[PDB]
């Protein structure tokens, strides 16, 4: 029961409070970072390749 | 005699319509009203008597505090 859900989230719900967020490369609803709209395990395996501009490993 | 605890006929009035009722009890009632000089018993504070009770003579919706009356005094 996933591809049904990713459709629902893109449909406007009856009351505005129901609206919520998911990653796009996945449907994962938990741990989405608002600035990039990506989950916590797309933002990792993707900022390695060098496609999230300006992001790098942080020694300090 | 002697065993019988203290007792005293007293005066009762309804606080809603002054329905005076002459009765008796063992209570002091901590009052003194000169009604019927020579029997100036203490009055006792009471609720609305059966002289004006809804079920008794005149049926009427009366709120006995709180419950249905607390709402009417804040939502309106």
């Amino acid at each position: 029961a996933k591809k049904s859900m990713i459709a629902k989230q893109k449909r406007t719900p009856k009351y505005a409070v129901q609206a919520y967020t998911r990653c796009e490369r996945c449907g994962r609803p938990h741990s989405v970072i608002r600035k990039f709209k990506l989950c916590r395990i797309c933002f990792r395996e993707l900022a390695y390749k060098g496609q999230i501009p300006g992001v790098k490993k942080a020694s300090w | 005699t002697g065993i019988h605890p203290e007792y005293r006929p007293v005066v009762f009035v309804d606080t809603s319509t002054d329905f005076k009722f002459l009765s008796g009890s063992t209570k002091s009632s901590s009052e003194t009203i000169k009604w019927e000089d020579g029997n100036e018993y203490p009055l006792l504070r009471v609720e609305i008597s059966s002289d004006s009770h809804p079920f008794y003579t005149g049926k009427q919706k009366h709120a006995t505090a709180d419950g249905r009356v607390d709402r009417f005094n804040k939502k309106y």
Binding site: - | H4, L22, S23, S25, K27, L44, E47, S50, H53
Partner: protein
Amino acid sequence: NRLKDQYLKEIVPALMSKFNYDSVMEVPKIDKIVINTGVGDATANAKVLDSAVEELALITGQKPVITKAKNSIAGFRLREGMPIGAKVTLRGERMYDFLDKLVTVSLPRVRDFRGVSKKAFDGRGNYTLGVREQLIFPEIRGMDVVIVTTAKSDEESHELLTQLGMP
């Protein structure tokens, strides 16, 4: 004195004209009252008995006489001569006075006083009121209030007690 005044002034001729009695004293009249508490739960407690003693004394104006157990029954570990329950009798002038204090001060304080049906008569006329708490009393468990009348049946008692103003 007010209740006797109303009874002899108006209630007596009212009953007489209702039933067309031969003489004056065939009219039913209130005869006695008995107050029972029934504290049978006092299987071993002692302060319960004494507390009921002052409670009923304050309600009445007389010392109650606690009653010894009629017989020893094992189902309630009841033994012979165990003082269980109390009784107080008001006769003469107390009869109307306690009634008045009940009906004008105590009875109106009943939360949902819808009265008892006419069915609760013994068939002779004597009526028992089963009151549910001691806090209804003006001064301050379940118990019974009986009424003894000179009525030959139940309907006459009903009409006279309604003449007194209560159901």
